[PDB]
Amino acid sequence: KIESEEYNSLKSSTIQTIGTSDGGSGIGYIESGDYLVFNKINFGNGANSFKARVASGADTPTNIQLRLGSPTGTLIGTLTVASTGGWNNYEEKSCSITNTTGQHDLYLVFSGPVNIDYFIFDSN
Ligand SMILES: O[C@@H]1[C@@H](O)[C@H](O[C@@H]2CO[C@@H](O[C@@H]3CO[C@@H](O[C@@H]4CO[C@@H](O[C@@H]5CO[C@@H](O)[C@H](O)[C@H]5O)[C@H](O)[C@H]4O)[C@H](O)[C@H]3O)[C@H](O)[C@H]2O)OC[C@H]1O
Ligand SMILES: [Ca+2]
C-alpha cells in the first residue's frame, strides 16, 4: 500500500493534496500529462494486481498508466476510472498488471482528472 499524498516527486502545475470526508488525504486537481513518482518501490514477492481508492466527477474516463523507471518506461498496466458519482465519492477500482518483482521507481501517469487516496499492489 502507497498513499498518493506521500509521493517523492511529481510533474504538475495544478496537483493539490486534498482531504476526504472520512478524515483521510489524497491527491486532486490532476490534469492530463501529470504524473506522481514513488521511488524504490519493492514489489517484493510478486504483483499482478493494482487497486486504487479513487473518486471522479469527470464526464470522460481518466487512464492511470503504471510505468516503471521513467514516465515513458515499461507500461505494466492501466487503470481506467470513469465517474464514481462525484469528486468525494470514493470507490476501490482494480486492474491486472504484468507480473512485477524487484525494485523500481513507479510513475503514475494521468490522462485527465481523478481524485486518488491510496493504491495497493497484490497477487491474485
Ligand atoms: O476537507 C475535504 C476537502 O479537501 C474536499 O475537497 C474536495 C477536494 O477535491 C475536489 O475535487 C476537485 C474538483 O475539481 C476538479 O476539477 C475539474 C476536473 O474536471 C474538469 O473537466 C474535465 C475536462 O476534461 C474533460 O475531458 C473531463 O471529462 C472533464 O471532467 C473540470 O473543468 C475541473 O473543474 C478536480 O480535478 C478535483 O480534484 C472536490 O471538489 C472538493 O470538494 O472535500 C471533502 C472535505 O472533507
Ligand atoms: Ca491517502
Short mmCIF file of all heavy atoms in Angstrom, two decimals, residues 74-119:
data_model
loop_
_atom_site.label_atom_id
_atom_site.label_comp_id
_atom_site.label_asym_id
_atom_site.label_seq_id
_atom_site.Cartn_x
_atom_site.Cartn_y
_atom_site.Cartn_z
N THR A 74 8.62 1.04 -19.08
CA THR A 74 7.78 -0.13 -19.20
C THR A 74 6.39 0.14 -18.60
O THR A 74 6.26 0.44 -17.42
CB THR A 74 8.42 -1.33 -18.49
OG1 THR A 74 9.65 -1.67 -19.16
CG2 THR A 74 7.56 -2.58 -18.61
N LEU A 75 5.38 0.01 -19.44
CA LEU A 75 3.98 0.12 -19.04
C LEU A 75 3.49 -1.23 -18.55
O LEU A 75 3.29 -2.13 -19.37
CB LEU A 75 3.16 0.56 -20.25
CG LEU A 75 1.81 1.29 -20.20
CD1 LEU A 75 0.78 0.55 -21.02
CD2 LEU A 75 1.34 1.68 -18.81
N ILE A 76 3.27 -1.40 -17.23
CA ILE A 76 2.79 -2.68 -16.67
C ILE A 76 1.26 -2.83 -16.58
O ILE A 76 0.75 -3.94 -16.40
CB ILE A 76 3.43 -2.95 -15.29
CG1 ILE A 76 3.02 -1.89 -14.25
CG2 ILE A 76 4.96 -3.02 -15.41
CD1 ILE A 76 3.44 -2.27 -12.80
N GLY A 77 0.53 -1.73 -16.71
CA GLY A 77 -0.92 -1.77 -16.75
C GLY A 77 -1.49 -0.37 -16.74
O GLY A 77 -0.75 0.61 -16.64
N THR A 78 -2.81 -0.29 -16.87
CA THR A 78 -3.52 0.99 -16.95
C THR A 78 -4.86 0.82 -16.24
O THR A 78 -5.67 -0.02 -16.68
CB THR A 78 -3.76 1.37 -18.41
OG1 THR A 78 -2.50 1.51 -19.10
CG2 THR A 78 -4.42 2.74 -18.51
N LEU A 79 -5.11 1.62 -15.19
CA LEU A 79 -6.42 1.67 -14.54
C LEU A 79 -7.24 2.79 -15.17
O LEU A 79 -6.83 3.95 -15.19
CB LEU A 79 -6.28 1.91 -13.04
CG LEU A 79 -7.60 1.92 -12.28
CD1 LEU A 79 -8.17 0.49 -12.30
CD2 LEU A 79 -7.42 2.40 -10.84
N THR A 80 -8.40 2.45 -15.72
CA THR A 80 -9.30 3.43 -16.30
C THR A 80 -10.46 3.72 -15.34
O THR A 80 -11.19 2.82 -14.91
CB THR A 80 -9.81 2.94 -17.67
OG1 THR A 80 -8.68 2.73 -18.53
CG2 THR A 80 -10.64 4.02 -18.36
N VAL A 81 -10.62 5.00 -15.01
CA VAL A 81 -11.58 5.42 -13.99
C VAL A 81 -12.62 6.35 -14.60
O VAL A 81 -12.30 7.46 -15.03
CB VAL A 81 -10.89 6.16 -12.80
CG1 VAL A 81 -11.90 6.53 -11.74
CG2 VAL A 81 -9.78 5.32 -12.24
N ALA A 82 -13.84 5.86 -14.70
CA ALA A 82 -14.98 6.71 -15.04
C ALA A 82 -15.59 7.32 -13.78
O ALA A 82 -15.14 7.02 -12.68
CB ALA A 82 -15.98 5.90 -15.80
N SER A 83 -16.60 8.18 -13.95
CA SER A 83 -17.25 8.82 -12.81
C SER A 83 -17.69 7.80 -11.77
O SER A 83 -18.27 6.78 -12.11
CB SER A 83 -18.48 9.63 -13.22
OG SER A 83 -19.26 10.01 -12.09
N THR A 84 -17.45 8.13 -10.50
CA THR A 84 -17.94 7.38 -9.36
C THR A 84 -19.16 8.04 -8.73
O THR A 84 -19.63 7.58 -7.69
CB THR A 84 -16.86 7.32 -8.26
OG1 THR A 84 -16.51 8.66 -7.90
CG2 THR A 84 -15.59 6.63 -8.74
N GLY A 85 -19.60 9.13 -9.32
CA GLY A 85 -20.77 9.86 -8.87
C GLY A 85 -20.42 11.25 -8.39
O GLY A 85 -21.29 12.10 -8.32
N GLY A 86 -19.14 11.50 -8.12
CA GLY A 86 -18.72 12.79 -7.63
C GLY A 86 -17.29 12.76 -7.13
O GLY A 86 -16.72 11.70 -6.90
N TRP A 87 -16.75 13.94 -6.94
CA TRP A 87 -15.36 14.10 -6.55
C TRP A 87 -15.05 13.66 -5.14
O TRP A 87 -13.87 13.44 -4.81
CB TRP A 87 -14.92 15.56 -6.72
CG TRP A 87 -14.99 15.98 -8.11
CD1 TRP A 87 -15.90 16.82 -8.67
CD2 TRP A 87 -14.15 15.54 -9.16
NE1 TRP A 87 -15.67 16.94 -10.02
CE2 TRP A 87 -14.59 16.17 -10.35
CE3 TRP A 87 -13.05 14.67 -9.23
CZ2 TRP A 87 -13.99 15.94 -11.57
CZ3 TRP A 87 -12.45 14.48 -10.43
CH2 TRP A 87 -12.93 15.08 -11.59
N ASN A 88 -16.06 13.51 -4.28
CA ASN A 88 -15.84 12.99 -2.93
C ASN A 88 -16.49 11.64 -2.67
O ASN A 88 -16.61 11.22 -1.51
CB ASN A 88 -16.30 14.01 -1.89
CG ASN A 88 -15.53 15.32 -1.99
OD1 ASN A 88 -14.30 15.32 -2.18
ND2 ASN A 88 -16.24 16.44 -1.88
N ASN A 89 -16.88 10.94 -3.73
CA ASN A 89 -17.50 9.62 -3.64
C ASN A 89 -16.46 8.59 -4.07
O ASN A 89 -16.30 8.29 -5.26
CB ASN A 89 -18.75 9.53 -4.51
CG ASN A 89 -19.78 10.58 -4.14
OD1 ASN A 89 -20.24 10.62 -3.00
ND2 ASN A 89 -20.17 11.39 -5.10
N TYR A 90 -15.75 8.03 -3.10
CA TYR A 90 -14.67 7.11 -3.36
C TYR A 90 -15.15 5.68 -3.53
O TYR A 90 -16.12 5.26 -2.88
CB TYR A 90 -13.60 7.21 -2.26
CG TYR A 90 -12.80 8.47 -2.33
CD1 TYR A 90 -13.28 9.66 -1.77
CD2 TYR A 90 -11.61 8.53 -3.06
CE1 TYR A 90 -12.58 10.84 -1.89
CE2 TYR A 90 -10.92 9.70 -3.18
CZ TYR A 90 -11.40 10.85 -2.60
OH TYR A 90 -10.72 12.04 -2.74
N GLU A 91 -14.51 5.00 -4.46
CA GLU A 91 -14.68 3.58 -4.72
C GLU A 91 -13.32 2.95 -4.91
O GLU A 91 -12.35 3.60 -5.29
CB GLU A 91 -15.51 3.36 -5.98
CG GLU A 91 -16.94 3.86 -5.95
CD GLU A 91 -17.66 3.62 -7.26
OE1 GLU A 91 -17.19 2.81 -8.08
OE2 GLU A 91 -18.70 4.26 -7.50
N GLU A 92 -13.23 1.64 -4.66
CA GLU A 92 -11.99 0.91 -4.96
C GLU A 92 -12.08 0.23 -6.30
O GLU A 92 -13.02 -0.51 -6.55
CB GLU A 92 -11.65 -0.07 -3.83
CG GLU A 92 -11.26 0.71 -2.58
CD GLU A 92 -11.20 -0.10 -1.30
OE1 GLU A 92 -10.71 -1.24 -1.34
OE2 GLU A 92 -11.65 0.41 -0.27
N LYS A 93 -11.15 0.55 -7.20
CA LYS A 93 -11.14 0.02 -8.55
C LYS A 93 -9.83 -0.68 -8.81
O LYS A 93 -8.79 -0.22 -8.34
CB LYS A 93 -11.33 1.14 -9.57
CG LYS A 93 -12.61 1.92 -9.40
CD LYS A 93 -13.84 1.10 -9.65
CE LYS A 93 -15.03 1.95 -9.98
NZ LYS A 93 -16.20 1.10 -10.40
N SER A 94 -9.88 -1.79 -9.55
CA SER A 94 -8.71 -2.62 -9.81
C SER A 94 -8.49 -2.93 -11.30
O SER A 94 -9.43 -2.91 -12.10
CB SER A 94 -8.81 -3.96 -9.06
OG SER A 94 -9.28 -3.78 -7.74
N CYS A 95 -7.24 -3.18 -11.63
CA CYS A 95 -6.79 -3.70 -12.93
C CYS A 95 -5.70 -4.75 -12.72
O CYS A 95 -4.97 -4.75 -11.72
CB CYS A 95 -6.26 -2.58 -13.87
SG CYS A 95 -4.81 -1.71 -13.31
N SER A 96 -5.57 -5.65 -13.70
CA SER A 96 -4.44 -6.56 -13.73
C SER A 96 -3.19 -5.81 -14.23
O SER A 96 -3.29 -4.86 -15.00
CB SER A 96 -4.75 -7.73 -14.68
OG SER A 96 -4.96 -7.24 -15.98
N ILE A 97 -2.02 -6.24 -13.76
CA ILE A 97 -0.75 -5.75 -14.26
C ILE A 97 0.14 -6.94 -14.64
O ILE A 97 -0.06 -8.06 -14.14
CB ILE A 97 -0.01 -4.85 -13.22
CG1 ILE A 97 0.26 -5.57 -11.91
CG2 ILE A 97 -0.82 -3.59 -12.88
CD1 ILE A 97 1.25 -4.89 -11.04
N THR A 98 1.09 -6.68 -15.54
CA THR A 98 2.09 -7.67 -15.89
C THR A 98 2.85 -7.96 -14.61
O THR A 98 3.28 -7.04 -13.92
CB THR A 98 3.04 -7.13 -17.00
OG1 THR A 98 3.69 -5.93 -16.56
CG2 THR A 98 2.28 -6.70 -18.23
N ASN A 99 2.96 -9.24 -14.26
CA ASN A 99 3.57 -9.63 -13.01
C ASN A 99 4.91 -8.94 -12.85
O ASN A 99 5.75 -9.00 -13.75
CB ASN A 99 3.77 -11.14 -12.89
CG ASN A 99 4.27 -11.54 -11.51
OD1 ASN A 99 3.49 -11.93 -10.64
ND2 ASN A 99 5.58 -11.44 -11.30
N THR A 100 5.10 -8.32 -11.69
CA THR A 100 6.23 -7.44 -11.42
C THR A 100 6.90 -7.81 -10.10
O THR A 100 6.23 -7.95 -9.08
CB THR A 100 5.72 -5.98 -11.35
OG1 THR A 100 5.22 -5.60 -12.63
CG2 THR A 100 6.86 -5.01 -11.07
N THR A 101 8.22 -7.97 -10.15
CA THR A 101 9.01 -8.23 -8.94
C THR A 101 10.26 -7.35 -8.97
O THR A 101 10.72 -6.94 -10.03
CB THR A 101 9.38 -9.77 -8.80
OG1 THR A 101 10.41 -10.12 -9.71
CG2 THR A 101 8.21 -10.69 -9.20
N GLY A 102 10.79 -7.02 -7.79
CA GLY A 102 12.02 -6.25 -7.70
C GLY A 102 11.81 -4.78 -7.43
O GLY A 102 10.70 -4.34 -7.20
N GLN A 103 12.89 -4.00 -7.50
CA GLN A 103 12.89 -2.60 -7.09
C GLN A 103 12.87 -1.63 -8.26
O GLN A 103 13.85 -1.51 -9.01
CB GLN A 103 14.12 -2.31 -6.23
CG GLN A 103 14.16 -0.89 -5.66
CD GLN A 103 14.91 -0.80 -4.34
OE1 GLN A 103 14.66 -1.58 -3.41
NE2 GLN A 103 15.84 0.16 -4.25
N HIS A 104 11.75 -0.92 -8.42
CA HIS A 104 11.62 0.06 -9.48
C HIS A 104 11.01 1.35 -8.95
O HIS A 104 10.20 1.32 -8.02
CB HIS A 104 10.75 -0.49 -10.63
CG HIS A 104 10.92 -1.96 -10.88
ND1 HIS A 104 11.64 -2.45 -11.94
CD2 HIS A 104 10.44 -3.03 -10.21
CE1 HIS A 104 11.60 -3.77 -11.92
NE2 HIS A 104 10.88 -4.15 -10.88
N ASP A 105 11.42 2.45 -9.55
CA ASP A 105 10.70 3.71 -9.43
C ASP A 105 9.35 3.49 -10.14
O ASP A 105 9.28 2.81 -11.16
CB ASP A 105 11.46 4.86 -10.10
CG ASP A 105 12.82 5.10 -9.49
OD1 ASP A 105 13.01 4.67 -8.33
OD2 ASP A 105 13.74 5.70 -10.11
N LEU A 106 8.30 4.07 -9.57
CA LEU A 106 6.95 3.92 -10.12
C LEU A 106 6.41 5.29 -10.48
O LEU A 106 6.42 6.21 -9.66
CB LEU A 106 6.03 3.27 -9.09
CG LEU A 106 4.53 3.29 -9.42
CD1 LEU A 106 4.18 2.40 -10.59
CD2 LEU A 106 3.74 2.86 -8.21
N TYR A 107 5.94 5.43 -11.71
CA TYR A 107 5.34 6.65 -12.21
C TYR A 107 3.87 6.37 -12.49
O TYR A 107 3.54 5.47 -13.25
CB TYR A 107 6.00 7.13 -13.51
CG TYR A 107 7.45 7.57 -13.31
CD1 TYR A 107 8.44 6.65 -13.07
CD2 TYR A 107 7.78 8.90 -13.33
CE1 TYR A 107 9.77 7.06 -12.84
CE2 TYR A 107 9.10 9.33 -13.11
CZ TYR A 107 10.07 8.39 -12.87
OH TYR A 107 11.36 8.83 -12.64
N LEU A 108 2.98 7.15 -11.87
CA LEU A 108 1.55 7.09 -12.21
C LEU A 108 1.31 8.24 -13.13
O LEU A 108 1.49 9.38 -12.74
CB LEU A 108 0.64 7.20 -11.00
CG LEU A 108 0.66 6.09 -9.95
CD1 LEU A 108 -0.59 6.18 -9.07
CD2 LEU A 108 0.87 4.72 -10.45
N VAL A 109 0.92 7.95 -14.37
CA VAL A 109 0.83 8.99 -15.39
C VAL A 109 -0.66 9.11 -15.75
O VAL A 109 -1.30 8.13 -16.15
CB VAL A 109 1.69 8.67 -16.64
CG1 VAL A 109 1.59 9.79 -17.66
CG2 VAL A 109 3.14 8.45 -16.27
N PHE A 110 -1.19 10.31 -15.63
CA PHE A 110 -2.63 10.55 -15.72
C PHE A 110 -3.05 11.20 -17.04
O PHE A 110 -2.45 12.15 -17.49
CB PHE A 110 -3.10 11.45 -14.56
CG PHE A 110 -2.86 10.85 -13.20
CD1 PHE A 110 -1.65 11.01 -12.55
CD2 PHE A 110 -3.86 10.11 -12.58
CE1 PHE A 110 -1.44 10.44 -11.32
CE2 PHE A 110 -3.64 9.50 -11.34
CZ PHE A 110 -2.45 9.69 -10.70
N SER A 111 -4.16 10.73 -17.61
CA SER A 111 -4.67 11.31 -18.85
C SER A 111 -5.70 12.40 -18.65
O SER A 111 -6.21 12.98 -19.62
CB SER A 111 -5.23 10.20 -19.77
OG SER A 111 -6.50 9.73 -19.33
N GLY A 112 -6.05 12.67 -17.40
CA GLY A 112 -7.14 13.55 -17.02
C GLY A 112 -7.33 13.54 -15.52
O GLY A 112 -6.49 12.98 -14.82
N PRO A 113 -8.37 14.21 -15.03
CA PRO A 113 -8.59 14.37 -13.60
C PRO A 113 -9.14 13.09 -12.95
O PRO A 113 -9.85 12.29 -13.56
CB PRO A 113 -9.63 15.48 -13.53
CG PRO A 113 -10.35 15.39 -14.79
CD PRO A 113 -9.39 14.93 -15.82
N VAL A 114 -8.77 12.95 -11.70
CA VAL A 114 -9.26 11.89 -10.80
C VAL A 114 -8.77 12.26 -9.42
O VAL A 114 -7.69 12.82 -9.29
CB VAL A 114 -8.75 10.45 -11.20
CG1 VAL A 114 -7.24 10.30 -11.14
CG2 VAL A 114 -9.42 9.36 -10.34
N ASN A 115 -9.55 11.93 -8.39
CA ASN A 115 -9.09 12.08 -7.00
C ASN A 115 -8.63 10.72 -6.51
O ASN A 115 -9.35 9.73 -6.67
CB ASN A 115 -10.16 12.67 -6.08
CG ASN A 115 -10.41 14.17 -6.34
OD1 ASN A 115 -9.64 14.79 -7.08
ND2 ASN A 115 -11.48 14.73 -5.74
N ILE A 116 -7.43 10.64 -5.95
CA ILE A 116 -6.88 9.35 -5.54
C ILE A 116 -6.39 9.42 -4.11
O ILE A 116 -5.63 10.31 -3.73
CB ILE A 116 -5.79 8.89 -6.53
CG1 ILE A 116 -5.25 7.53 -6.13
CG2 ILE A 116 -4.68 9.95 -6.75
CD1 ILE A 116 -4.42 6.94 -7.19
N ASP A 117 -6.82 8.44 -3.32
CA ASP A 117 -6.49 8.38 -1.89
C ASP A 117 -5.25 7.52 -1.65
O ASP A 117 -4.26 7.98 -1.03
CB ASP A 117 -7.73 7.84 -1.18
CG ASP A 117 -7.57 7.67 0.33
OD1 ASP A 117 -6.47 7.86 0.87
OD2 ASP A 117 -8.55 7.33 1.05
N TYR A 118 -5.32 6.27 -2.11
CA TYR A 118 -4.22 5.33 -1.98
C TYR A 118 -4.32 4.27 -3.04
O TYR A 118 -5.32 4.15 -3.72
CB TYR A 118 -4.18 4.67 -0.59
CG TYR A 118 -5.43 3.88 -0.23
CD1 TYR A 118 -5.66 2.61 -0.76
CD2 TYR A 118 -6.34 4.39 0.71
CE1 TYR A 118 -6.81 1.91 -0.40
CE2 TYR A 118 -7.49 3.71 1.05
CZ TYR A 118 -7.70 2.44 0.51
OH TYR A 118 -8.82 1.72 0.85
N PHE A 119 -3.27 3.46 -3.14
CA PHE A 119 -3.26 2.31 -4.03
C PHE A 119 -2.48 1.15 -3.43
O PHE A 119 -1.66 1.36 -2.57
CB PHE A 119 -2.80 2.67 -5.45
CG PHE A 119 -1.47 3.38 -5.52
CD1 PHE A 119 -0.29 2.67 -5.67
CD2 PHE A 119 -1.41 4.77 -5.43
CE1 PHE A 119 0.90 3.31 -5.75
CE2 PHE A 119 -0.21 5.42 -5.49
CZ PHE A 119 0.95 4.69 -5.66
#
